[PDB]
Enzyme design. Sequence first.
Site, PDB file in Angstrom:
ATOM      1  N   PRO A  40      90.742  76.446  77.350  1.00  0.00           N
ATOM      2  CA  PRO A  40      90.488  75.692  76.119  1.00  0.00           C
ATOM      3  C   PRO A  40      89.320  74.725  76.269  1.00  0.00           C
ATOM      4  O   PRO A  40      89.100  74.189  77.357  1.00  0.00           O
ATOM      5  CB  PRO A  40      91.796  74.909  75.905  1.00  0.00           C
ATOM      6  CG  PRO A  40      92.810  75.540  76.836  1.00  0.00           C
ATOM      7  CD  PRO A  40      92.015  76.061  77.981  1.00  0.00           C
ATOM      8  N   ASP A  41      88.577  74.513  75.189  1.00  0.00           N
ATOM      9  CA  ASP A  41      87.554  73.483  75.159  1.00  0.00           C
ATOM     10  C   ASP A  41      88.248  72.161  74.833  1.00  0.00           C
ATOM     11  O   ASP A  41      89.475  72.101  74.790  1.00  0.00           O
ATOM     12  CB  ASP A  41      86.472  73.827  74.132  1.00  0.00           C
ATOM     13  CG  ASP A  41      86.945  73.685  72.709  1.00  0.00           C
ATOM     14  OD1 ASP A  41      88.061  73.170  72.488  1.00  0.00           O
ATOM     15  OD2 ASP A  41      86.187  74.079  71.800  1.00  0.00           O
ATOM     16  N   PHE A  42      87.481  71.105  74.601  1.00  0.00           N
ATOM     17  CA  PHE A  42      88.054  69.775  74.403  1.00  0.00           C
ATOM     18  C   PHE A  42      88.293  69.432  72.936  1.00  0.00           C
ATOM     19  O   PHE A  42      89.377  68.989  72.569  1.00  0.00           O
ATOM     20  CB  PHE A  42      87.133  68.729  75.034  1.00  0.00           C
ATOM     21  CG  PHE A  42      87.086  68.801  76.532  1.00  0.00           C
ATOM     22  CD1 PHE A  42      86.175  69.616  77.175  1.00  0.00           C
ATOM     23  CD2 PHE A  42      87.973  68.073  77.297  1.00  0.00           C
ATOM     24  CE1 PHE A  42      86.141  69.695  78.540  1.00  0.00           C
ATOM     25  CE2 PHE A  42      87.941  68.146  78.668  1.00  0.00           C
ATOM     26  CZ  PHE A  42      87.023  68.959  79.289  1.00  0.00           C
ATOM     27  N   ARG A  43      87.283  69.656  72.103  1.00  0.00           N
ATOM     28  CA  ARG A  43      87.282  69.128  70.741  1.00  0.00           C
ATOM     29  C   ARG A  43      87.434  70.171  69.634  1.00  0.00           C
ATOM     30  O   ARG A  43      87.274  69.844  68.461  1.00  0.00           O
ATOM     31  CB  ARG A  43      86.009  68.317  70.518  1.00  0.00           C
ATOM     32  CG  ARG A  43      85.898  67.148  71.479  1.00  0.00           C
ATOM     33  CD  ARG A  43      84.578  66.419  71.370  1.00  0.00           C
ATOM     34  NE  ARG A  43      84.538  65.285  72.291  1.00  0.00           N
ATOM     35  CZ  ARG A  43      84.322  65.391  73.597  1.00  0.00           C
ATOM     36  NH1 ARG A  43      84.115  66.580  74.149  1.00  0.00           N
ATOM     37  NH2 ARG A  43      84.313  64.308  74.356  1.00  0.00           N
ATOM     38  N   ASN A 112      81.220  71.495  82.829  1.00  0.00           N
ATOM     39  CA  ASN A 112      82.524  72.067  83.155  1.00  0.00           C
ATOM     40  C   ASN A 112      82.903  71.894  84.612  1.00  0.00           C
ATOM     41  O   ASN A 112      82.052  71.683  85.474  1.00  0.00           O
ATOM     42  CB  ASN A 112      82.565  73.560  82.817  1.00  0.00           C
ATOM     43  CG  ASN A 112      82.261  73.840  81.370  1.00  0.00           C
ATOM     44  OD1 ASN A 112      82.387  72.967  80.518  1.00  0.00           O
ATOM     45  ND2 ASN A 112      81.858  75.060  81.079  1.00  0.00           N
ATOM     46  N   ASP A 114      85.205  74.252  86.011  1.00  0.00           N
ATOM     47  CA  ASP A 114      85.982  75.474  86.224  1.00  0.00           C
ATOM     48  C   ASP A 114      85.414  76.368  87.337  1.00  0.00           C
ATOM     49  O   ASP A 114      86.049  77.341  87.735  1.00  0.00           O
ATOM     50  CB  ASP A 114      86.095  76.263  84.917  1.00  0.00           C
ATOM     51  CG  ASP A 114      84.749  76.564  84.293  1.00  0.00           C
ATOM     52  OD1 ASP A 114      83.783  76.836  85.032  1.00  0.00           O
ATOM     53  OD2 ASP A 114      84.658  76.527  83.052  1.00  0.00           O
ATOM     54  N   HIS A 131      79.524  66.818  85.542  1.00  0.00           N
ATOM     55  CA  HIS A 131      80.767  66.073  85.401  1.00  0.00           C
ATOM     56  C   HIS A 131      81.703  66.278  86.591  1.00  0.00           C
ATOM     57  O   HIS A 131      82.914  66.137  86.464  1.00  0.00           O
ATOM     58  CB  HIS A 131      81.468  66.452  84.096  1.00  0.00           C
ATOM     59  CG  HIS A 131      80.738  66.005  82.866  1.00  0.00           C
ATOM     60  ND1 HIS A 131      81.143  66.347  81.593  1.00  0.00           N
ATOM     61  CD2 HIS A 131      79.639  65.230  82.712  1.00  0.00           C
ATOM     62  CE1 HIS A 131      80.323  65.810  80.711  1.00  0.00           C
ATOM     63  NE2 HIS A 131      79.400  65.128  81.365  1.00  0.00           N
TER      64      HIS A 131
HETATM   65  N1  LIG Z   1      84.226  80.905  72.697  1.00  0.00           N
HETATM   66  C1  LIG Z   1      83.216  80.167  72.156  1.00  0.00           C
HETATM   67  N2  LIG Z   1      82.013  80.750  71.790  1.00  0.00           N
HETATM   68  C2  LIG Z   1      81.075  79.920  71.263  1.00  0.00           C
HETATM   69  N3  LIG Z   1      81.100  78.591  71.019  1.00  0.00           N
HETATM   70  C3  LIG Z   1      82.308  78.034  71.389  1.00  0.00           C
HETATM   71  C4  LIG Z   1      83.370  78.765  71.948  1.00  0.00           C
HETATM   72  N4  LIG Z   1      84.475  77.948  72.226  1.00  0.00           N
HETATM   73  C5  LIG Z   1      84.081  76.718  71.837  1.00  0.00           C
HETATM   74  N5  LIG Z   1      82.774  76.735  71.308  1.00  0.00           N
HETATM   75  C6  LIG Z   1      82.094  75.554  70.858  1.00  0.00           C
HETATM   76  O1  LIG Z   1      81.813  74.820  72.011  1.00  0.00           O
HETATM   77  C7  LIG Z   1      81.770  73.437  71.773  1.00  0.00           C
HETATM   78  C8  LIG Z   1      82.759  72.812  72.724  1.00  0.00           C
HETATM   79  O2  LIG Z   1      82.847  71.480  72.432  1.00  0.00           O
HETATM   80  P1  LIG Z   1      83.689  70.553  73.414  1.00  0.00           P
HETATM   81  O3  LIG Z   1      85.089  71.090  73.593  1.00  0.00           O
HETATM   82  O4  LIG Z   1      83.544  69.156  72.959  1.00  0.00           O
HETATM   83  O5  LIG Z   1      83.278  70.707  74.968  1.00  0.00           O
HETATM   84  P2  LIG Z   1      82.231  69.969  75.856  1.00  0.00           P
HETATM   85  O6  LIG Z   1      82.021  70.773  77.123  1.00  0.00           O
HETATM   86  O7  LIG Z   1      80.909  69.879  75.116  1.00  0.00           O
HETATM   87  O8  LIG Z   1      82.689  68.511  76.307  1.00  0.00           O
HETATM   88  C9  LIG Z   1      81.890  67.646  77.042  1.00  0.00           C
HETATM   89  C10 LIG Z   1      82.753  66.595  77.753  1.00  0.00           C
HETATM   90  O9  LIG Z   1      83.735  66.038  76.885  1.00  0.00           O
HETATM   91  C11 LIG Z   1      84.946  65.777  77.602  1.00  0.00           C
HETATM   92  O10 LIG Z   1      85.132  64.413  77.527  1.00  0.00           O
HETATM   93  C12 LIG Z   1      84.712  66.180  79.076  1.00  0.00           C
HETATM   94  O11 LIG Z   1      84.218  65.104  79.791  1.00  0.00           O
HETATM   95  C13 LIG Z   1      83.582  67.223  78.918  1.00  0.00           C
HETATM   96  O12 LIG Z   1      82.812  67.371  80.082  1.00  0.00           O
HETATM   97  C14 LIG Z   1      82.252  73.252  70.323  1.00  0.00           C
HETATM   98  O13 LIG Z   1      81.096  72.992  69.604  1.00  0.00           O
HETATM   99  C15 LIG Z   1      82.908  74.628  69.961  1.00  0.00           C
HETATM  100  O14 LIG Z   1      82.668  74.946  68.638  1.00  0.00           O
END
Ligand SMILES: Nc1ncnc2c1ncn2[C@@H]1O[C@H](COP(=O)(O)OP(=O)(O)OC[C@H]2O[C@H](O)[C@H](O)[C@@H]2O)[C@@H](O)[C@H]1O
Lengths: 299, 297
Positions: A40-43, A112, A114, A131
């Site tokens: 999973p992503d964060f936001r 990341n 990972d 990070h």
């Molecule tokens: N499968 C996918 N394909 C394309 N785009 C995607 C996909 N999944 C997600 N996205 C987009 O990917 C983006 C993911 O946004 P975020 O989850 O904020 O991740 P970060 O790596 O930038 O977080 C940075 C720091 O925040 C934390 O505090 C930690 O410290 C982290 O290091 C969104 O725009 C989704 O639409």
Amino acid sequence: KERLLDELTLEGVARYMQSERCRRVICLVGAGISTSAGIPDFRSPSTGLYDNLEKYHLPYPEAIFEISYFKKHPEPFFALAKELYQFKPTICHYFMRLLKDKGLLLRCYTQNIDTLERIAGLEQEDLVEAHGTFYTSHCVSASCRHEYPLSWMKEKIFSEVTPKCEDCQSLVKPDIVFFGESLPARFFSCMQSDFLKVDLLLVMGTSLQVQPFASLISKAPLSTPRLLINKEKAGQSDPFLGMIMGLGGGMDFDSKKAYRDVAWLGECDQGCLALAELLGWKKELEDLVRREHASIDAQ
Amino acid sequence: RLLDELTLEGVARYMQSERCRRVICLVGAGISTSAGIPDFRSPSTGLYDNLEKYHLPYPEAIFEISYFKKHPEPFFALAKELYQFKPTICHYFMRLLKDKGLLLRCYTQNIDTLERIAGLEQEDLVEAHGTFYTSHCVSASCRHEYPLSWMKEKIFSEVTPKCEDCQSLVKPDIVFFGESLPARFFSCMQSDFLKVDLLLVMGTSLQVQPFASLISKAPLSTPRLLINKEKAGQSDPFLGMIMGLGGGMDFDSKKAYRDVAWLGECDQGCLALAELLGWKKELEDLVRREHASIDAQ
Ligand SMILES: Nc1ncnc2c1ncn2[C@@H]1O[C@H](COP(=O)(O)OP(=O)(O)OC[C@H]2O[C@H](O)[C@H](O)[C@@H]2O)[C@@H](O)[C@H]1O
Ligand SMILES: Nc1ncnc2c1ncn2[C@@H]1O[C@H](COP(=O)(O)OP(=O)(O)OC[C@H]2O[C@H](O)[C@H](O)[C@@H]2O)[C@@H](O)[C@H]1O
Ligand SMILES: [Zn+2]
Ligand SMILES: [Zn+2]
């Protein structure tokens, strides 16, 4: 401030990439490039980690990675750490491996933790882990800073034992960067040099919602084209109170004055496949993924 | 390098020179504390440490547009609870810059209007975080304007305002988190910061964007003087930093060349500089006169 792209499209960027002027590419990546892998992503809404932390009773989600809250209550972070302790790299990852093997990859700066970049084949020289990492852990006291290995941290984690320094009894945490924490020095040494002569930036899978990483797109020359491959646009917004980006330090995809930024919206993997095909690497990429994934399953 | 030494004395000498023709002032809530108006982030005394009665998840929520649309009651409660004050010596010093043809612009994050009451005009001012004078419906489609009178009646009547047309919330044009800043902020910014010979920064923590970015918009040669209780804008980088990387102040490093921190009360720093410039008596007489006039209903 020059326009090098003949047109602000993936196609124009591909043409530029196959030109001679484009020798050094920097990739800026986030959690989006690993979602296709099961991480999973964060936001992201509903799906994102920050929308799934209710059981830890945080005042706000980011608190779980905030150094002050952590010292005061480190139990939640380690609970989450074990709850989310294997995955394979994605086409995005192997597309970056391709860039490397084709001699275009100056550096990948990643947010990341990972390690899929290493697994995809990227070596440490190629990588700025902006990070941090889990591989090494450190006692939090600035005097001590006693290092501890991954095996020890695991033991503590799954043993459900809140790590403490055998020496100073202070807290011990993995060298992943918390809010309020300083970033690894390598981040800065590599940035001062890397961005002086970069011909293309490739931004993928990040919302660009955290500093100082977000500043990196501003560190490149004004002539350097920048391509975002992301489900949603990032870095482009009108100025509002609380914005993360510095004024004028963002992306300009759509304005009348747009000249070097291009936004491909969709999955990272599909944008990477599309580019490859436009470049003539599509079957090479596919074969790389099938092969590596296969070799992985064998383990 | 334009300053001969990184001290108030070097800045005053520079200001008396012919190379200092245009001054931009950047001000925040710290210039209004001496008048009885609390700032935001000073511990215990600051507003954000005094909002517990509203049971917020975090203090900024009371000025955040999303929490506001979900929970508008606390804001208006506070809006009447914090609904007179006089301008301080710092404000009249800025008026003094105006009167001597040295003031290109004052950009303020404040909404207390003491800059205007102090004698600054609309052209001299960029109210970067808006104003209470006008209010608008939150719907981008509607955007029905309402007057100060309307908002007052509603607030003191303990009446949560709604738009007469769309029944959506109505709020004064003070800038919340998530909200866009006034266009004038950017139009004035683009031109102003090409021709500024000195930045005077006073009474702000530089903890919010896009205002914090303004110091980076000035030419690299342009000296920058901070007059504040604490140093601001100078920090090692960290995850979550507000400043863009390399976009801050350098008062103390070996590479420092243009940035000076005078630490103390804004009024006293302005009195010290005035003295250095030979304007102290003129300043004190201006403050006395205008305050006297004020008292005179
Ligand atoms: N499968 C996918 N394909 C394309 N785009 C995607 C996909 N999944 C997600 N996205 C987009 O990917 C983006 C993911 O946004 P975020 O989850 O904020 O991740 P970060 O790596 O930038 O977080 C940075 C720091 O925040 C934390 O505090 C930690 O410290 C982290 O290091 C969104 O725009 C989704 O639409
Ligand atoms: N009497 C004084 N003399 C000198 N400095 C002072 C004095 N009193 C306070 N200070 C300093 O003044 C500084 C005031 O810090 P902050 O409280 O953040 O106010 P802001 O104007 O920068 O807030 C900006 C935005 O944030 C909000 O969200 C709103 O949107 C605001 O518009 C501190 O460093 C004090 O040490
Ligand atoms: Zn220790
Ligand atoms: Zn309306």
